[PDB]
Amino acid sequence: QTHNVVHEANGVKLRETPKEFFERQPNKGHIHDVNQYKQMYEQSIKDPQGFFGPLAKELLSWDHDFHTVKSGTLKNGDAAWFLGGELNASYNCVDRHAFANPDKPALICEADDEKDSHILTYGDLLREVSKVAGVLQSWGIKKGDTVAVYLPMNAQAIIAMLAIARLGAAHSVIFAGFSAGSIKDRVNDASCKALITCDEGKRGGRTTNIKKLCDEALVDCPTVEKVLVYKRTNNPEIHLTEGRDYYWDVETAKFPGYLPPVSVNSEDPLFLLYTSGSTGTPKGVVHSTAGYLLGAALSTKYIFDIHPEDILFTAGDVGWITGHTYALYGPLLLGVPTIIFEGTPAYPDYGRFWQIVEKHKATHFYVAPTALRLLRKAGEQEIAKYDLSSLRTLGSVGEPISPDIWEWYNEFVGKNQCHISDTYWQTESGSHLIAPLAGVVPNKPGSASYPFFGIDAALIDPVTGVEIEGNDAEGVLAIKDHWPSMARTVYKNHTKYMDTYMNPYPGYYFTGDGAARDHDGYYWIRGRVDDVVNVSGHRLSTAEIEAALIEDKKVSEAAVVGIHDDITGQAVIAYVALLQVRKTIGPFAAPKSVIIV
Amino acid sequence: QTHNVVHEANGVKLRETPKEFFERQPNKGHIHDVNQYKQMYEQSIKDPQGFFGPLAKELLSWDHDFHTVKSGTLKNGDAAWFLGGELNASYNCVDRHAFANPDKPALICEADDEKDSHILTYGDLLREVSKVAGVLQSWGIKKGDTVAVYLPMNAQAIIAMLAIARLGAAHSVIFAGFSAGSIKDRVNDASCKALITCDEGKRGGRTTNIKKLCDEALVDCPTVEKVLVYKRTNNPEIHLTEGRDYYWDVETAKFPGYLPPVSVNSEDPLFLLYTSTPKGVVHSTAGYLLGAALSTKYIFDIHPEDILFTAGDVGWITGHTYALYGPLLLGVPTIIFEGTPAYPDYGRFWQIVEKHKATHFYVAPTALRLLRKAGEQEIAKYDLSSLRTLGSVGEPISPDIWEWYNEFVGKNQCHISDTYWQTESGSHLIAPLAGVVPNKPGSASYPFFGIDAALIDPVTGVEIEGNDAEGVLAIKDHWPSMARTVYKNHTKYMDTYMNPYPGYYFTGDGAARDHDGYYWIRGRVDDVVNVSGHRLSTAEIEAALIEDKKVSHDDITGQAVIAYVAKELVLQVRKTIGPFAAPKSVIIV
Amino acid sequence: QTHNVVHEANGVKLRETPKEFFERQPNKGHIHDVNQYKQMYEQSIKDPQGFFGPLAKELLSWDHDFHTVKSGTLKNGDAAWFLGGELNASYNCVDRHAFANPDKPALICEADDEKDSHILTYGDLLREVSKVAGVLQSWGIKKGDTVAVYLPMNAQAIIAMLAIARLGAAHSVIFAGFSAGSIKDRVNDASCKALITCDEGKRGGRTTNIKKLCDEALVDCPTVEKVLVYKRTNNPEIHLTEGRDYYWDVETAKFPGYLPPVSVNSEDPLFLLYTSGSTGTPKGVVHSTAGYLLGAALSTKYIFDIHPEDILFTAGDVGWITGHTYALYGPLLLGVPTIIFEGTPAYPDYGRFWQIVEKHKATHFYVAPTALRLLRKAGEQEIAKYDLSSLRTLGSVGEPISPDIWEWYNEFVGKNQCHISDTYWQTESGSHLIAPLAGVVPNKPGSASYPFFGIDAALIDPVTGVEIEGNDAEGVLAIKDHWPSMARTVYKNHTKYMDTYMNPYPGYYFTGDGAARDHDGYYWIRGRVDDVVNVSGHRLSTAEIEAALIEDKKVSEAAVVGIHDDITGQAVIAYVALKEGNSDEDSEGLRKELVLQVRKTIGPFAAPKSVIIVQDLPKTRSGKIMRRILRKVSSNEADQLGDISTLSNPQSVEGIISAFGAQFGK
Ligand SMILES: Nc1ncnc2c1ncn2[C@@H]1O[C@H](COP(=O)(O)O)[C@@H](O)[C@H]1O
Ligand SMILES: Nc1ncnc2c1ncn2[C@@H]1O[C@H](COP(=O)(O)O)[C@@H](O)[C@H]1O
Ligand SMILES: Nc1ncnc2c1ncn2[C@@H]1O[C@H](COP(=O)(O)O)[C@@H](O)[C@H]1O
């Protein structure tokens, strides 16, 4: 009953989900209790064909039926799901709901300034996606191409991603906070034929130089033939290059409000998302179509307990995987409205998150602990001004959540009446790996709890590389078989993919994280074992910051470490031996302080 | 019984279809009587899914089943039909009939000079289409591309169109009477990658300079990579540009008589058709084909044993729908006439009908007016007793011409179908169903399946309830064969059809509805002139006149155009718009 | 009982299949008896829709069902099968077997040197095919493109072909023994965007200069954008051209072990295979996808009696149609292992074939008579060293098999316990046309026996062009309706296709062969009726050889004919006339040079057996060479030339007879 290895586990009472959760639940839950969960879970590991087969047919609409549920192994890096099947990501996210209820809200868009907020119905989204898709089709964008997206977190970003997917092309979303150099690297690696952006961005009332950074990068991007520019501010001083740049509003007006979607194979790439690794240059993580969409829909439904009547607010950016899966693909596949927030939790005041939740009666809130830490510092008193009683599920993502923040999250936001789901996962998993199912799995503050369907989690002895049997254990977190939404390769560098995930511990997938398993099977994430730092939820590479410092002619040696920060979670401190990081990686990746030694 | 608004209807006796019509009918009619028609019609308006769904499966062959019959609205300009479905236009017009009866006639080709006439079976047609499609495929023509066609009304025009559609590309047929400037505009707007044409054309004994005008236009058409040239006259003095121009016979000889068709979506473009700067009217694939087959079957009463003669040019929608797609979809032979009604003599139309025992005749009133003036005596020299349906298209038909049409051509034994429609509707909108709807001479009668016709008060934009009324003709919901956009200019599409009267489709025509529900077309309300059935833009004629450095009613053509400018000036309009659009007389003021 | 025309059939006892054949048979045979065969055959001719429709659904995996089994006619050259259907060749040959049993052997690869041999499972093959397909896809190779393959008979050649087919492209395999000139012709006719080859080849212990000949050809192949090079020897002195050439291992490492296959139409081109005609320029024979695959699976299954437990050894090269159909597509469609042999039957010794069969317990052996004649001459003593008791079906292909060799094959290889399948067919037929079904059709040594499913064979009177009714007859061999695996065209030259196969005898397919039909319906192939030579079972173009000799500026006239060879069946004899030659001793030095010029233009395998130097060739009034005279002189029938006063230079004949006599041996 006492853990000698998992010291976080001693004396931690299980936290049942509050009674108000089930009062607010609009229908009978998708899973009765944890005992039904383990039965379903045991099938997803022992019999994936019988478990995922029906779920894929239930949750997805297919243009061609699949003949094989599961293929490949980790050691060979040839995983595949629903082979032979065809579908379209934008049909499952838009069309099928537009035909059913075209007036149902799809994108609840809360702008940086609330005056600019708006709502797109599923019918509205279909027309806007069709029109943008029509623009790209006339430009020659076809299945197999990649299209870059450099946009803030607003309606246009979602429309761009779905419009690209509508044609069978693969979108590559570049976070709007990246510098011009980072844009150059990602666009060139994928050899994108087109780019979608805007003139300027609004964030916290400040104006972002979006189109300006694109131009600086595009001088070294010979593959980019055309650029679509949305007039977000309509600043007339923004230069467009004749013959290359065209306005979003001008071109979409030329095309009809419906365009047929293009069928793609289950294993055709849906998108590339570039992530910073422990060594070298950022790598383009590739996700399939069917496996990723099933992972997105399945986790959104069961881990958050989403029903058609619900409304999800994921306070994350599509520049990162959190926005891809749980701001766009997850909720739209299920046909529920999703709240797309362009601004910050502090503008105009630290009650923005809560005013939004109250305004739209959101039932699910998904946020990073970094924001929780900041709101506890500057805006705790603002919570009580707003209703917030429509919520029943509160999500945590991107970084470990201390038991302290978990309790504050539960009490001040949840009124001690909501379920909290600390979801562990990463860009390469596509969707959740370990997380407490809402209304099913009791919580231990600071623990991700049980592995999700299809995730056979394990602990490996780092010194011997041998899997650790039994509980009260610690080691590197690894998965024993692949899962539908697992990333399939690194763009045109499958060797880097293998050396990173499949080769370090043959037969397993290597998460790069350490974890612990207590007497009850609950998993406690202990953080990265490589040289990767998660600052404010953003995965950074200490090697990538060191490389930026060395680019300066003054610097000869540079080493980046990590410290504990009560607001940024993890801070990075640079040691240099004889603004550069803000122009190489981006303002968000800047060192906290540079120490000259 | 008394009309105070629709004065055309007063004292107009209903004209039942003659008994000889049903004697000549080869099978029991497709609709028993007007009472079954109204039932079928009322379902097509109240329950389109249950009506068109089954008909789409009956009349068309699908590569992928559709999951939604109908989507979109006019107010949003996002109409779509049979979503998720896949098919191929050339498979439904050729392959499926060639496999069933390869020796059945498909294209009955009557050349300008009868010595050059010939007949292609469905098996022959499949091979010629496959061969041309193979040439284009080897040139890189792929689904999504556009291919221009500048050919007379002969087998090559039909084969080219079906070959382009076989690859999933969209053909853009340019009337062979257009000038080099008009060719340049259409090719560049569509950005065609290839062009199919011939060296010269023969029409009425005259030689037309087809390839010569193409070369003149192609100096300003950078998108055209290759040109396929058919030796219509084999005149050896016609130059081919090395590396761009290739001979039809030489290239088709390199490829096999079967090429797999390419599946396209129900809503993928089938073709562009430019109508008067000119605009490319775009038609979908599945909806357009269903409209063509549905109207051809029920309005004309077409059975497999029948033979259709549409005296129209593929340069216009009439040739697209009722000379090619309509008849071929149903698997019947279609007569493709390259010449004029007067060459070699004014009995040509009737000699053709006799020669091939045609059962259906479809012509424009302008041709009837000409034959009535110059060739009435020739009609009685030919049999013509195989006919039972006589169609009129393109312009209103006077009660006089209706009676002359009925008496001298029909011998008072045929059903007459005055069909109202336009390029953007794809197929018939208002027409008397053969053997079902009694006629009122000069009236198109009842709206067709899926057409919910209405009259709108132009001043208030409010729909007019009740009969004995007049107003702007508008339709209250979209239909399968309705055009979907204007190529790369959807904004003009909306401003022309959907925005003038939101929620309705604006035909640009005024009409009247009498106490029996019959519609009387009263003509255009905008500034478009229909000369001999050709929709012209008076703005386009004025614009051509000003380009010149110097410049700063008809009883046969229906409408003539007179220019007021302040021998050469007529030729200037012939070089900008085309000889067919030339002013009758230019008055210099 | 006595044949007055088919003299090969007189006094020939039927040879029933030995009882040991059925003991070794692993399951119930696919055909009950000869009567069930005749019933199935009669349906395949009278009711093709009802016969091939069901078989097509049984043996092939479809991505889209077909709506029409059969379309078109021969006279119109628009044959088509399974219209509307979609499938992929690499899915039916790899994926569906890998998913079922990924560990089952697929390619049993026996290298030129046995130390380098290896085995790929269907799981391995799926990964290697997926990776190469990924490279080609990233290079822009898409459905409709052609990709050349210039590789030896090993694992990479099979992987290359299947990877190309996986993307919907059409592969054009170029035999590894061709010179740079033959490569240039084939690559340019097809306008290939990419080429897959290796640095060097090993065959019989000898090193072949593959990439070197490849580079030499590519200087005149502007269509080739990129080249994939496999390190067969890893010889570091082999230059790769920057920007065009890339290493197989380097590029394949960048892509994952699964790639979705691309659905193609039943009638989309699967491959081009260039064949020599009486034309001088090679012809790209085009094969469909669905029809060709069904023919391969159907014939492999029923003619050879292949079961999942079996192991097939087709001793043929993918450079020729026999490797395409019966080393690759046939066995892999059925999911059985296939033995891919890179070397020769003589290296390291003349028991190699038998060492391979014994090593892997092969159940089926498929070889050309030329090899049997060589082994009978040089390697009969090697047979007694090996087991060979796992075989039950012995096939012969490519050329006529004499009754003597039939018996030698039967006794020394089959130990008088195997069924022998003399299979008649050709590059353009895709699969077997006339052959004795294993365990079903009794044999007549030297006869192909009965026509196979869907082949309505006929004999046409050469004088009247009228089909011959009744048996004990001889004439032109023709087929009365098209069949699934029939070639569909000649690449971008359908007119040559029609003029060659469909127009000579309207309503029929013209095989180019003469045959005879005896009183039992058995067909006896009598050889080509056009002037085409089969050297070692392979079609050569004497016109193409003449052109190579003339390229040498020493030569002014050249005429090449075929004659009898006791090992290769037919050899080619060149008659050359030089401009100001003379020197009746320097001749030997000139003859040697002329040979080497053909070896560097077409290839060593197509080099003439002997070059005869003459003063002029027999020419007609119009000035055309009378090759019939050269044929008859070269076979010692200088009597039986007839009246030659039709020649413009009859006095030349005497010199032809003396030259051949004096120079043939030397
Ligand atoms: N619930 C969690 N607990 C601990 N760490 C987390 C959690 N969620 C995400 N992470 C970290 O975030 C990384 C993934 O970040 P990213 O690749 O940016 O999505 C993981 O590898 C973890 O280190
Ligand atoms: N039966 C008819 N009666 C009157 N006008 C007609 C009739 N049929 C067609 N039209 C005219 O033809 C025009 C279409 O021309 P086009 O676009 O060239 O086919 C319509 O707008 C009508 O003015
Ligand atoms: N079993 C056989 N008997 C006799 N000749 C054959 C046989 N198989 C193939 N051939 C010959 O090989 C030719 C085909 O050449 P190729 O396709 O190049 O191998 C045929 O036309 C025949 O002349």
Short mmCIF file of C-alpha atoms in Angstrom, two decimals, chain C residues 217-389:
data_model
loop_
_atom_site.label_atom_id
_atom_site.label_comp_id
_atom_site.label_asym_id
_atom_site.label_seq_id
_atom_site.Cartn_x
_atom_site.Cartn_y
_atom_site.Cartn_z
CA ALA C 217 23.05 5.25 -73.62
CA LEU C 218 21.72 8.08 -71.45
CA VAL C 219 23.69 10.71 -73.39
CA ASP C 220 20.94 10.38 -76.04
CA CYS C 221 17.98 9.93 -73.65
CA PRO C 222 16.85 13.48 -72.78
CA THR C 223 13.64 12.17 -71.17
CA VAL C 224 15.43 10.40 -68.29
CA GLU C 225 15.40 12.84 -65.36
CA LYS C 226 16.71 10.57 -62.58
CA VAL C 227 18.39 7.18 -62.16
CA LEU C 228 18.29 4.79 -59.19
CA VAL C 229 21.50 2.78 -58.78
CA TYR C 230 21.77 -0.37 -56.66
CA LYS C 231 25.21 -1.24 -55.27
CA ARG C 232 25.45 -4.79 -56.57
CA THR C 233 29.25 -4.90 -56.28
CA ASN C 234 29.82 -1.62 -54.39
CA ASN C 235 32.80 -1.03 -56.70
CA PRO C 236 33.81 2.54 -55.74
CA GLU C 237 35.20 3.31 -59.22
CA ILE C 238 31.69 3.41 -60.75
CA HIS C 239 30.85 7.06 -61.39
CA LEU C 240 27.43 8.52 -60.61
CA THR C 241 26.39 11.67 -62.46
CA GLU C 242 25.60 14.51 -60.07
CA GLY C 243 21.98 15.63 -60.19
CA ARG C 244 20.76 12.56 -62.11
CA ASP C 245 22.04 9.39 -60.38
CA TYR C 246 21.16 8.36 -56.82
CA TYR C 247 21.93 5.27 -54.76
CA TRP C 248 19.19 2.74 -54.08
CA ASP C 249 20.12 2.27 -50.42
CA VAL C 250 20.57 5.99 -49.75
CA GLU C 251 17.20 7.07 -51.13
CA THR C 252 15.11 4.09 -49.98
CA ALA C 253 16.27 4.78 -46.41
CA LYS C 254 14.33 8.08 -46.49
CA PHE C 255 10.89 6.49 -46.93
CA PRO C 256 8.68 4.16 -44.88
CA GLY C 257 8.09 0.45 -45.39
CA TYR C 258 4.48 0.92 -46.46
CA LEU C 259 3.09 2.99 -49.32
CA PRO C 260 -0.55 2.87 -50.49
CA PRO C 261 -0.85 1.29 -53.94
CA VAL C 262 -2.55 3.25 -56.70
CA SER C 263 -5.70 1.80 -58.25
CA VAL C 264 -5.51 1.44 -62.03
CA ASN C 265 -8.15 0.50 -64.57
CA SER C 266 -8.34 -3.05 -65.88
CA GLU C 267 -7.11 -1.70 -69.23
CA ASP C 268 -4.43 0.70 -67.99
CA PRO C 269 -0.97 -0.33 -69.23
CA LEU C 270 0.90 -2.59 -66.82
CA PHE C 271 4.15 -2.79 -68.77
CA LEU C 272 5.93 -2.38 -72.08
CA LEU C 273 8.18 -5.19 -73.31
CA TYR C 274 10.24 -4.42 -76.38
CA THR C 275 10.31 -7.20 -78.96
CA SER C 276 12.24 -7.58 -82.19
CA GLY C 277 10.26 -7.65 -85.41
CA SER C 278 11.09 -7.89 -89.11
CA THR C 279 11.45 -4.12 -88.97
CA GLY C 280 14.85 -3.06 -87.64
CA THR C 281 13.29 -0.97 -84.84
CA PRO C 282 12.09 -2.68 -81.63
CA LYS C 283 8.37 -2.72 -80.81
CA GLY C 284 7.04 -1.90 -77.37
CA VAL C 285 4.45 -4.59 -76.69
CA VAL C 286 1.89 -3.20 -74.25
CA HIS C 287 -0.01 -5.39 -71.81
CA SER C 288 -3.11 -4.48 -69.84
CA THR C 289 -3.30 -4.97 -66.07
CA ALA C 290 -6.34 -7.12 -65.27
CA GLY C 291 -6.32 -9.33 -68.36
CA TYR C 292 -2.59 -9.95 -68.19
CA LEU C 293 -2.67 -10.84 -64.48
CA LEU C 294 -5.62 -13.22 -64.88
CA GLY C 295 -3.84 -15.00 -67.73
CA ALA C 296 -0.69 -15.36 -65.65
CA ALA C 297 -2.55 -16.68 -62.60
CA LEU C 298 -4.87 -18.88 -64.66
CA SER C 299 -2.13 -20.55 -66.71
CA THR C 300 0.32 -20.86 -63.81
CA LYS C 301 -2.38 -22.55 -61.73
CA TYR C 302 -3.99 -24.92 -64.24
CA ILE C 303 -1.22 -25.64 -66.75
CA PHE C 304 1.52 -26.22 -64.14
CA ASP C 305 -0.72 -27.40 -61.25
CA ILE C 306 0.53 -24.88 -58.71
CA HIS C 307 -0.72 -25.03 -55.11
CA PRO C 308 0.19 -22.86 -52.09
CA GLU C 309 2.58 -25.57 -50.87
CA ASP C 310 4.52 -25.52 -54.15
CA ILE C 311 7.75 -23.74 -55.11
CA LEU C 312 8.32 -22.61 -58.70
CA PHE C 313 11.72 -22.29 -60.40
CA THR C 314 11.39 -20.52 -63.75
CA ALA C 315 14.89 -20.52 -65.24
CA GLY C 316 14.22 -17.36 -67.21
CA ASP C 317 15.19 -13.71 -67.18
CA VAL C 318 12.80 -10.81 -66.60
CA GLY C 319 14.37 -9.31 -69.72
CA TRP C 320 11.97 -11.60 -71.60
CA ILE C 321 8.27 -12.34 -71.27
CA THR C 322 8.87 -15.72 -69.63
CA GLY C 323 10.37 -14.02 -66.58
CA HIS C 324 7.59 -11.42 -66.50
CA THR C 325 4.76 -13.95 -66.45
CA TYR C 326 6.14 -17.13 -64.86
CA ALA C 327 9.03 -15.92 -62.70
CA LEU C 328 7.17 -12.91 -61.26
CA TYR C 329 3.48 -12.25 -61.87
CA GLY C 330 2.25 -15.83 -62.13
CA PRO C 331 3.68 -17.32 -58.93
CA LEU C 332 3.34 -14.17 -56.82
CA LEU C 333 -0.34 -13.76 -57.70
CA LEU C 334 -0.88 -17.29 -56.37
CA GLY C 335 1.19 -16.52 -53.26
CA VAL C 336 3.86 -19.19 -53.73
CA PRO C 337 7.65 -18.76 -53.54
CA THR C 338 9.49 -18.13 -56.79
CA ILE C 339 13.18 -18.82 -57.39
CA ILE C 340 15.06 -15.90 -58.96
CA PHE C 341 18.36 -17.12 -60.43
CA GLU C 342 20.93 -14.46 -61.30
CA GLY C 343 23.62 -16.71 -62.82
CA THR C 344 23.96 -19.37 -65.50
CA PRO C 345 23.38 -23.15 -65.53
CA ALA C 346 27.14 -23.70 -65.91
CA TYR C 347 28.62 -21.66 -63.04
CA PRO C 348 30.32 -22.91 -60.93
CA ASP C 349 29.43 -26.25 -62.58
CA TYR C 350 26.79 -27.75 -64.87
CA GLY C 351 24.81 -29.01 -61.86
CA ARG C 352 23.71 -25.56 -60.68
CA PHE C 353 20.09 -25.91 -61.79
CA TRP C 354 19.91 -29.20 -59.90
CA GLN C 355 21.73 -27.83 -56.85
CA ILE C 356 19.08 -25.09 -56.66
CA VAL C 357 16.13 -27.47 -57.04
CA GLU C 358 17.54 -29.78 -54.37
CA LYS C 359 18.44 -26.91 -52.03
CA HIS C 360 14.91 -25.45 -51.95
CA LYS C 361 12.84 -28.57 -52.70
CA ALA C 362 11.36 -26.93 -55.79
CA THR C 363 8.26 -28.66 -57.16
CA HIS C 364 8.12 -27.03 -60.62
CA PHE C 365 10.95 -26.41 -63.10
CA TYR C 366 10.47 -24.24 -66.21
CA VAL C 367 13.31 -24.00 -68.75
CA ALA C 368 14.16 -23.52 -72.43
CA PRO C 369 15.25 -26.49 -74.59
CA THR C 370 18.50 -24.66 -75.40
CA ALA C 371 19.58 -25.17 -71.79
CA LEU C 372 18.59 -28.85 -71.84
CA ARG C 373 20.69 -29.36 -74.97
CA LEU C 374 23.68 -27.71 -73.28
CA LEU C 375 23.26 -29.76 -70.10
CA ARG C 376 22.91 -32.94 -72.15
CA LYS C 377 26.20 -32.10 -73.87
CA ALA C 378 28.25 -30.91 -70.89
CA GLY C 379 26.48 -31.81 -67.64
CA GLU C 380 24.68 -35.15 -67.81
CA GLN C 381 27.11 -36.56 -65.23
CA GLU C 382 26.10 -33.87 -62.71
CA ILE C 383 22.49 -35.05 -62.39
CA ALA C 384 23.32 -38.13 -60.32
CA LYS C 385 24.68 -35.89 -57.54
CA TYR C 386 21.34 -34.33 -56.59
CA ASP C 387 18.02 -35.54 -55.17
CA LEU C 388 15.51 -33.81 -57.50
CA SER C 389 12.62 -35.93 -56.16
#
